[PDB]
Amino acid sequence: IRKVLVANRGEIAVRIIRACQELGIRTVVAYSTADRDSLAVRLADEAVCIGPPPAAKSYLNAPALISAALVSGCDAIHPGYGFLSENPYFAEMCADCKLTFIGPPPEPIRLMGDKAIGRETMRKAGVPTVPSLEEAIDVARQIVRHVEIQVLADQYGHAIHLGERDCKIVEEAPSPAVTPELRERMGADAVRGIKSIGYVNAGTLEFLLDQDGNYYFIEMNTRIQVEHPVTEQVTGIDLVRWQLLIASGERLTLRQEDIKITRHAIECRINAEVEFYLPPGGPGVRVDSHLYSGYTPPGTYDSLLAKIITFGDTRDEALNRMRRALNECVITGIKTTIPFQLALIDDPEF
Amino acid sequence: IRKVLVANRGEIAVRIIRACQELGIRTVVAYSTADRDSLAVRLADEAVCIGPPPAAKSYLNAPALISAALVSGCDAIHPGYGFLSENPYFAEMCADCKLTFIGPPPEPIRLMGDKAIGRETMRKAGVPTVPGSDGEVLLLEKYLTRVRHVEIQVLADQYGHAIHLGERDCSAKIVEEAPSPAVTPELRERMGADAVRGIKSIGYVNAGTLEFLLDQDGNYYFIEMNTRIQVEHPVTEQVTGIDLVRWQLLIASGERLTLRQEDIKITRHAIECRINAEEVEFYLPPGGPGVRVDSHLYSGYTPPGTYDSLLAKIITFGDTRDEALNRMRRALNECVITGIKTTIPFQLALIDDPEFRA
């Protein structure tokens, strides 16, 4: 992979540019009339305006995105999260036009696009899923947290799991209800399922968790999630770089024994000019944002402004480091979701 | 500890305030008239002007600082690094006035304060010292050329327990790295053991850093010791998982180092760039994966010139040394410190210099 087209905006745009740069991958970014003043335009080597401020006109328009890759010499497109990431047509078009879609192959996206088909595809895999009048009584005499599992795979059949995250305004990894043994079990079933559908790259399978520890699959996201940085903190893995590498055609040199959860991490999403922006910092803080002082946020797309992810060796260490980092994050000129999140962290029930 | 007074200015002060806050400790900052505009003043719970812009007048005024603590309800004083961090008197003075110096005792400060006495004290403690003067002549040592500057972090408690938390290649101080490319895992255990015993011999409590020199054949020679926290400490905390400033405050509250040496491993590769000055109208720190930024900068901050040139500290980490150096390049091309010139361009050049990489 030599030059990538980033077809998203915001944080995820900056995050893909950061991954690319760390790997020697040049970058061209796709922006709308509304996202001209994005940090991504500055951070990226090159940039192309694909359309008008509305999304259908722009980010959800594949012909424009492919054209941008082509004018720019990009050999790959990173979908990001949202938009056309889980669109199987865009993937096919990227291939037809000889560009590498950094993601799952078109077919796994379609199977998991319909929740029902996916639940069945997974039942066939052996992944646990949710459990005449007379027949109905009989079925009834034999008959929840939200936890998500991270998976990653090669173009050669090796897949791994990178753990669980608990859920969206706050996400924490590890789950506070998950023992090491369940995680291992939840993950294997997941890796097996992704292998069943022939999955390539990163993805996340959502499950619902019982009082007794029984797990039932709900949906799979064939993309990267907003919730990825928390997994990384706990495991030491750059998932975004790995996607670029896998797309390059490289093998997953990682193994399951290699992946272990070492820290407790929590992520809070800060959502709605940012006249002043002082991120937090110091020990135990990661800020993934596209904000800067002097930024007039476009309201055409999201609420998201910043993502602070605090880690620690205990859950309370991390919760207390977020306390600090949310009282240090100075997003001025706009009202933010920081005040609410501060309440949640110190909610006794949380 | 209920409340601490931060007796320093700058990036450092925010570090101690940050640590204190994580541990539930109230913070009062002491500032010069020049340093009222600082972030530390905003971040801190309370603030006391201890005096005018000159240091002797303000930050080297132990009476002002002690009084400030007392008036503000502070029961501890973190001397920071620099200033009176290694002044034996301020430590004694703090005790007599019923305050807790967040640092070593007054005598390991005093012995190690004179380099000559330090070399000597450590020689008698079994640590190899540089071939040179036995005592004072000014001190003389031999000029060792083919040597590298490596340093060992030591942490210790009031009950006689001490651990080393690794090495730091302080060679290049504008750039610091951990692990050293010359120190093998065994040597880290050897060098650090010599450091742990030495500090046990001198009766040390709290954080300190013994500085050594390492020959081409791998042999170490003590040169100096800083009985304080260092500007170079974030790098180790990123390879070990231990907060050094938090532990300082804890040791002085009288708590036991619950860390055995088995529990400390250098599992990553970190590196740190000091961005120096050689109004910040626009400040934008780097971030993302693998970046930690310790700074006092803000968009609008008028950096004083008075005490240091330091503007920011960027620390990047990774499983490989080049992974570390490549996340740095990004971090440095992302840091926008506008309105003041900085050292960033020189840092980006060295990180990509052939020798450094090797």
Numbering used by the authors:
A (entry chain A): 2 to 132, 140 to 151, 206 to 229, 237 to 341, 354 to 431
B (entry chain B): 2 to 138, 197 to 231, 237 to 342, 354 to 433
Original paper wording:
Notably, C. aurantiacus BC1 but not BC2, as well as the BCs from S. coelicolor, Roseiflexus castenholzii, and M. tuberculosis possess a C-terminal biotin/lipoyl attachment domain. Crystal packing analyses revealed two BC1 homodimers, but only one BC2 homodimer in each asymmetric unit. The superposition of one BC1-BC monomer with that of BC2 gave a root mean square deviation (RMSD) value of 0.654 Å, indicating that BC1 and BC2 possessed the same BC architectures. Each BC1-BC and BC2 homodimer was stabilized by extensive hydrogen bonding interactions between conserved amino acid pairs in the N- and C-terminal sub-domains. Specifically, the dimer interface residues Tyr44, Val328, Ser393 in BC1-BC homodimer, and Arg310 in BC2 dimer are not conserved with other reported BCs. Using NaHCO3 and biotin as substrates, both BC1 and BC2 were enzymatically active in catalyzing the biotin carboxylation reactions. However, BC1 had a relatively higher substrate affinity and turnover number than BC2. For BC2 that lacks a fused BCCP domain, it showed relatively lower biotin carboxylase activity and a dimer formation in solution. By contrast, the expression level of BC2 gradually decreases during the transition from respiratory to phototrophic conditions, suggesting that BC2 likely functions in pathways other than the 3-HP cycle. Since BC2 lacks the fused BCCP domain, it is probable that the BC2 participated biotin carboxylase reaction requires the involvement of a separate BCCP subunit (NCBI protein ID: ABY36917.1).
Acetyl-CoA carboxylases (ACCs) convert acetyl-CoA to malonyl-CoA, a key step in fatty acid biosynthesis and autotrophic carbon fixation pathways. Three functionally distinct components, biotin carboxylase (BC), biotin carboxyl carrier protein (BCCP), and carboxyltransferase (CT), are either separated or partially fused in different combinations, forming heteromeric ACCs. Here, we identify two BC isoforms (BC1 and BC2) from Chloroflexus aurantiacus, a filamentous anoxygenic phototroph that employs 3-hydroxypropionate (3-HP) bi-cycle rather than Calvin cycle for autotrophic carbon fixation. To investigate the structural basis of BC1 as a bi-functional enzyme, we determined the crystal structures of BC1 and BC2 at 3.2 Å and 3.0 Å resolutions, respectively.
